[PDB]
UniProtKB/TrEMBL annotation, chain A:
<dbReference type="GO" id="GO:0009279">
    <property type="term" value="C:cell outer membrane"/>
</dbReference>
<comment type="similarity">
    <text>Belongs to the SusD family.</text>
</comment>
<keyword id="KW-0998">Cell outer membrane</keyword>
<dbReference type="InterPro" id="IPR012944">
    <property type="entry name" value="SusD_RagB_dom"/>
</dbReference>
<dbReference type="Pfam" id="PF14322">
    <property type="entry name" value="SusD-like_3"/>
</dbReference>
<dbReference type="InterPro" id="IPR011990">
    <property type="entry name" value="TPR-like_helical_dom_sf"/>
</dbReference>
<dbReference type="InterPro" id="IPR033985">
    <property type="entry name" value="SusD-like_N"/>
</dbReference>
<feature type="domain" description="SusD-like N-terminal">
    <location>
        <begin position="11"/>
        <end position="192"/>
    </location>
</feature>
<dbReference type="Pfam" id="PF07980">
    <property type="entry name" value="SusD_RagB"/>
</dbReference>
<keyword id="KW-0472">Membrane</keyword>
<protein>
    <submittedName>
        <fullName>Liporotein</fullName>
    </submittedName>
</protein>
<keyword id="KW-0732">Signal</keyword>
<feature type="domain" description="RagB/SusD">
    <location>
        <begin position="235"/>
        <end position="513"/>
    </location>
</feature>
């Protein structure tokens, strides 16, 4: 909890190695939700833990959160500690005897990190308490929340300072640090979240000049390779973290891995994310044609996986993201590829089996990894910022600006890279939905859907009755209801924890809580 | 959260400075509850936040905790992280190129710390998951809880190793670190909790030889001086932490400071601990005579602070622990001493005002400190004091049948506050006298909760608690301050629900 300098002697900020270790500690404060609870609080997923952790984790889905049970994932509590560690750096770096150029670059990294930490809070609660110094007894602690606009201004001023102080690239040893590109890329998302469209376009223009390149995704394997640990050096990654959780209970891969693969491997997995029939329906055919829609099918209707072509002829991102009945995974594991069976094996009736009939692929390296048996690190390459987002943030801001042709050109870059034909749509209202739909498919299971629904204000449309599939034979299935969700507009903001509000007279709760 | 070595280069454990920093990080993992929630969950205090944080902090007081709302103070979650950091030290210290003697002492400090971290868990949940290595993907994580006996064995084996490897004393620079005495002192406490009485006596005998000495407490000022920052070098301290919380909302002093002292100073305090009438009633007269008892007084009855002598003629520990109506505090602050007023100023009707008519003194340095103005405040938390050796010894000696020995030991604690010696020869009666002495001596030192739990006296203590309300500058009435209840399941803290559902082999405590 305490900043790193509290462990050392009254000569820490002079030592370049200790100051470099302090910044490493700040990077170590980047948190990854292995359980992807926000995604499971969106129309993209129904958790395999829907029933097991209903009251603990998914009260949002039924508008049952309150200030007393906020289910904020302790972001308010945790992220102010992270911010405190940044503010300390900023307080003590001035007196540092380190070289001006190195001191400047490190300060830039802390600006990027502080911006990133505040953005995690702002995207949830809206306006927060803005702190640029480490509070002491000398300070007044009854500090009100600033406006959301002020908070977005604070984040963006930190990212402006970051773009001015960070390098575009690093040497072999320092690869993984924040770049000029990472700062501009985060800036464009923060600006898009606050509807600063003229600014988004400018930020995107900067990233286009920094030599990033979209990985070829004309095959499912090719697209999935963005997330491969053996491809961690590709030109699409702008900012990432190799997340290797200590415990099996919080390990991002094991938590979202198919459970009943125990005919060849084991039941070490927890199922985790359960892609919905609504998301499956949104994946287009390889030629840019819509697929058959199954979500609104009557429950007594039986389909044959081979007569209907439910999992046949889809665009590469479908096979890249979705583990479905008959999917082959773990090709380069001992014993080779295992075929996923929703009829006999991974069933909703079994504990931690998929309730939707689907599991996530994407950042799970089923292509290269071996099965995580107990005996004899299963990290995830969590890509916080990808080059694909620059195009989609640009497409979104360009449309809202009136540049329909620029928007079309930008979103068609994302479609071109998966062999999808170009969008032709000239109507702004129709083109907006097409961009939004592309964003959903592009960034599925990348912790964005929940904030896209929130910022686009499409909660009533998405938090409804969600569906999945259930197999009645090795070849046949029925469409099922997987979650009966509801909505209230207060859910456009996360409640501030009750104990925090009662602590301060000036601290005000979000509307509806 | 991650061990310190994860931030540095693959040459960390060779560097003596980095290894020394790792152990500093392990010491930094020692947590102090500035709000003293366990004490506020005992018959010694009714928090000024009784109503404000009823459902978040004090569900224990009304048997309303559950596996889903355990109110365990996140000890299970947090302490396994602390233990993980210890186990990594033990895994990687072998490869260290540091001097054998320094390496041995440091390893001893980590044994003491790991024992201390597991004891915080065991004293709450009972049996826990015993881990001596850092779990990896290679390991099976479905590990059941060990028995409470096994857990006490683990803690005590760590403390045995600590006594063998730690020095009795340090130089000026290394003062504050775990000593041989601290390890023996913690051992005696852990042994007493697990009713290993023959062992307690042996552990206490060792501390008596290590040159500790009880501070003279024949005056309230003298007794209070144990917790003075200007007396941090006294011979009574066995193990302590100078706790200086970052925020005003978690600062041990501000949280438990009299709120309405704003006639001379301010309203920066939050009241916090509210000594009960029940505890006030337990403080004897200076001559070892019982005081008048007021807790069961009728509510319509009015008393005069001067005709009755409620706060007059008490033994030094009374004035050393309790801030009551008419108490003078902040003598050596600018503007000088302020007099506490329960009639006009610090009233239960005011927010964060004392609901009992009392506030804690003890470790709040109202003698020396200046008022914490928000212009331009650490507590010396003494985890282990020499006074405990005598009382742990007295306890174990009585249960062993050494009534003469038990009397001798408890009379050491009474002698230092000018109280006459106990004469009681009956073991059953002497038991209660020792338990009574323990309550007064260690009031507001996070022990009462665990004393009630281990002695199994929950029904007797978690009832209707009382306090006072002033109706004039001189007159007061006795009030109900908390209507508590009890259930025997409260003799153990529930294991958090999400932890239980995670594992087939992980079993919940009885009643939850
Ligand atoms: Cl304040």
């Amino acid at each position: 909890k305490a900043p790193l300098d509290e462990i050392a002697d009254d000569s820490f900020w002079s030592d370049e190695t200790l100051v470099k270790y302090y910044v490493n500690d700040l990077y170590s404060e980047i948190s990854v939700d292995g359980l992807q609870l926000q995604e499971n609080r969106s129309d993209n997923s129904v958790s395999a833990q829907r029933d097991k952790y209903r009251a603990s984790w998914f009260k949002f889905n039924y508008d049952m959160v309150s200030a007393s049970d906020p289910q904020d994932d302790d972001v308010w509590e945790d992220y102010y500690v992270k911010v405190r560690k940044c503010n300390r750096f900023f307080e003590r770096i001035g007196t540092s005897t380190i070289e001006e150029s190195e001191k400047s670059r490190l300060t830039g990294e802390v600006h990027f990190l502080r911006a990133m930490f505040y953005f995690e809070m702002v995207k949830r609660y809206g306006g927060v308490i803005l702190l640029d110094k480490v509070l002491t007894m000398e300070d007044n602690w009854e500090i009100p929340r600033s406006s959301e606009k002020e908070c977005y201004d604070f984040i963006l001023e930190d990212l402006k300072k970051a773009t001015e102080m960070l390098p575009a690239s690093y040497g072999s040893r320092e690869k993984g640090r924040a770049t000029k590109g990472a700062a501009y890329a985060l800036k464009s998302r923060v600006e898009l979240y606050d509807k600063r469209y003229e600014d988004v376009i400018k930020s995107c223009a900067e990233v286009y000049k920094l030599g990033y390149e979209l990985v070829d995704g004309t095959t499912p394997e090719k697209y999935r390779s963005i997330w491969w640990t053996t491809n961690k050096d590709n030109k699409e990654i702008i900012f990432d973290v190799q997340y290797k959780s200590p415990d099996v209970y919080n390990n991002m891969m094991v938590c979202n891995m198919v459970t009943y693969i125990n005919d060849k491997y084991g039941d070490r997995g927890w199922g985790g994310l359960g892609p919905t029939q609504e998301l499956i329906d949104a994946f287009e055919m390889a030629d840019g044609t819509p697929a058959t829609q199954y979500s609104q099918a009557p429950a007594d209707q039986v389909f044959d996986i081979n007569t209907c072509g439910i999992y046949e002829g889809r665009e590469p991102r479908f096979y890249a993201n979705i583990v479905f009945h008959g999917s082959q995974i773990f090709f380069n594991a001992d014993k080779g590829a295992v075929t996923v069976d929703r009829y006999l094996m991974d069933t909703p009736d079994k504990g931690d089996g998929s309730l939707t009939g689907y599991n996530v692929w994407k950042w799970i390296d089923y292509d290269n990894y071996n099965y995580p048996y107990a005996g004899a690190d299963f990290s995830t390459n969590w890509i916080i910022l990808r080059y694909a987002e620059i195009y989609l943030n640009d497409a979104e801001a360009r449309l809202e600006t009136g540049d329909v042709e620029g928007a079309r050109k930008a979103v068609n870059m994302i479609r071109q890279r998966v062999g999808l034909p170009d969008l032709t749509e000239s109507d702004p209202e129709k083109l907006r939905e097409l961009i939004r739909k592309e964003r959903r498919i592009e960034f599925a299971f990348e912790e964005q859907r929940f904030y896209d629904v929130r910022r686009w204000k499409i909660g009533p449309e998405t938090q409804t009755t969600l569906h999945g599939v259930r197999f009645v034979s090795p070849t046949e299935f029925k469409v099922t209801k997987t979650d009966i969700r509801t909505w209230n507009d207060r859910l456009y903001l996360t409640p501030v924890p009750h104990d925090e509000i009662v602590r301060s007279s000036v601290l005000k709760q979000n509307l509806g809580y």
